[model samples]
Target: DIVMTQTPSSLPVSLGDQASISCRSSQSIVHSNGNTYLEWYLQKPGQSPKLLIYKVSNRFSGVPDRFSGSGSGTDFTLKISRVEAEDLGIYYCFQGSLVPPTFGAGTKLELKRGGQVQLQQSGPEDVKPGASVKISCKASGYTFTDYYMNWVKQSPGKGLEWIGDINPNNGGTSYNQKFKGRATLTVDKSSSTAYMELRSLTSEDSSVYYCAASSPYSMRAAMDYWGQGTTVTVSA
Candidate 1:
């Protein structure tokens, strides 16, 4: 797992202005494949998040030239050379250099004035050390099946651990081999929800679980919509 940090919690900008967001990783994100896996995403109010930049500096399909990304190793930057009305939202940086990809805390790029966001997770639960716990994440505010749904785990005070991603449209899934078998991902598109059932719970399984949604354009790594987070405690 890796820690991702985005600076300037909030940014106020006017139309046609430029905004620069800094996203730094705790360790180098250059993978053995000879590529850096840093990516940038933007989540607009009441809509699912979409990819802006990927692999550090390449824009996704249809992304305007105004949004450009540049960086290397553990430091990265996403710059909107010319901001627009539709660009106001939270910008997040995600890294896929390793298994269990991680995302930054996010930078809010807003108009000179106001705001306010959804995904719902199950309530906190305490389970026996050897028991199993099923966490639920319900999606709203956007079309559920249109995006890829993924799950992440966070031990207290620790970085995010990627569990896997499920395709709500087809029930197909891809998981971090680290969590395979132990973590099962499923979806109920009729209800617009996703679920992760963790078997053989242990102290290591005690953490907050989140379900996130990313545009199909970015597939597995560019998560934009995150759940409120569900907590699980393994004891006894």
Candidate 2:
């Protein structure tokens, strides 16, 4: 499940512009510990999905040096250099190298793509700690309510973990206050579905769980688009 492609879909720099966005990983996101799980995001319309760069260029937690990130296995590049008008909007590239975790739907110059953001497997999950679990995500072909059903939380090796967002248009939800109320974001605006409910689990809530999509403007942040992630195991 490694298909994340992003590139020029829209970009009209101005402020001091110098945009450049590209993320390709059909395979080879470089793992085994060498590192290259790629990460870069910015969705400034109202605010939420913002974490400059992580494994592929390191600059999160106060990111702002005109942003910069290079490439590695399977190609990667997220360069801002100057642009600022708050960076306009749209920009995402996420792949933490696991099973269901692929995102790239456009930014700087990318994905009218990720028409390959793989994430379809309604299986595998074990519960215990305080128990409660429900997960499913399927958004194909596009336009499933216009985007904003994001979810993230990975703990195995650790990296891109957000855990909140849903709004397939009206089913509104916005979590992430350290997973306020243990995480519960839902969306079923009609078809392509999206759901996540982890009531009180606690093995520290065992890891890996993802479902993605973005752009709803405001408090809905960004991941552009993704899926191919679900593996909740909160042991007995």
Candidate 3:
């Protein structure tokens, strides 16, 4: 897993001024395929995060040219020239070059006029070894099928793990392969909810779980929305 650090935590800007957010990864983000998976996103005041730049610098569909992504390997930048009013929220940098993708803490683009920014999980669960625990992430405020739902796990003192992702509309899924079988993903479209059941629990399975929603176009795009973490304590 990689660690990402974002700088200048907050930026004060004018409506037409330019802004730049820096993200540095603990490791090179280049993949064996000869491509970088760093991406930039913006979460508008009342909307889900939208992908502005992907694959290092390619603007996503419908994204304006004013938003540009640059840099490579361990360092990357997301710049907005002539920043608009709608761009007044948090900016996040993400890397998909490897499994267990990581995200930057985020930089706020506070305007001279404007500000800032989960899945709801059922209560925490306590289960014994060999038992199973299923967690729920329910979606509201947006069409459940508009994005891909992904799961992540963080154990005490450990980096995050990419559990898997599910397509709410078609019920399709992709797992981390490392987490395959041990983790199962399913969704109930009617209720706009996604579920992850961790079976064959062990002490290592005890962790805080989070469900994130990513680009509707590709599951690998980037995560913009996240569920409040659900705690699962696997004990004797």
Candidate 4:
């Protein structure tokens, strides 16, 4: 299991100011073929994580050119020129070139207040049925969707609920029959985005949300790598 560390846990940057974050890998991610499998993701306070870069500096599809990634081996960087209101969020780095992918905790970017920018979570842990809940995950290491990204749920007092999963490579999906009643899984292969939506929410919908990548080439293998995880509270 490779560990990822991020710097500047939080920052207050004015709009248009350039900002950057560093992701360091525990081992050399450079492959024999001469490729480093490092990537970056951004999670605005209340939204799911989106893939920003893959293959070191290759920007994912639909990502703005202004947001760029560079560096190699175990050292990498994610840079944003002229940051915008939409760029505000916690940024994370992931490494997928090796087994058991991992992610940096994240860097939160907040406005100085009085700024219209705002990020919101689903709120407390109690919600009535028929409501909706959403959560996000960001991958730090490896190829976009080279492995499967899975989603699971945990009721207030119960264990984990295996909702469904998506394959970032081809956009394929699978669901746990038990979760068919409340879960939907979708992904943007170009942006390396993985999303889960729970419609007609209920108290049972309260649980921690996890965005995970499959271990190396292990398709059905367990999620050896995972983001720090974002918790969603659904309340009425």
Candidate 2: the clashing residue pairs are 7-109, 7-110, 8-109, 8-110, 49-221, 49-222, 100-228, 100-229, 101-228, 119-228
Rank ordering of all candidates by TM-score, starting from the highest: 3, 1, 4, 2
> Across residues 13-115, which tens digit of lDDT does each residue of candidate 3 receive?
9977878888988988888868777778775544445667777877877777888869988888788888777777877787777876776777778967544
lDDT of each: 0.75, 0.67, 0.74, 0.63
lDDT of the structure predicted as candidate 3 = 0.74
TM agreement with the true structure for every prediction = 0.60, 0.34, 0.61, 0.55
Judged by TM-score relative to the true structure, which candidate is superior, 2 or 4? 4
lDDT of 4 by residue, 1-236 (tens): 56677777787778777888888778788766666777677776554566677678877766789899798767887888887888877777766565444557677877665552112223333445676655645444556645677664533365333466677766677766556545777776654567677776656666776655544322243242234455666666
Q: Model 1, stretches more than 4 Å misplaced?
A: 1-37, 40-69, 72-93, 97-117, 216-222
RMSD, each candidate, Å? 6.6, 14.3, 6.6, 10.4
Q: Model 2 lDDT vs. the true structure?
A: 0.67
lDDT, model 1, position 186:
88
Give, for candidate 2, the lowest lDDT window spanning 10 residues.
109-118
| Cα distance off (Å), candidate 3, residue 159 | 14
Best by TM-score: 3
Model 2 Cα lDDT, one tens digit per residue, 13-91: 6556477877877878777766555678775543345556767776765567888878888888888866656666777
Clashes of each: 0, 10, 4, 15
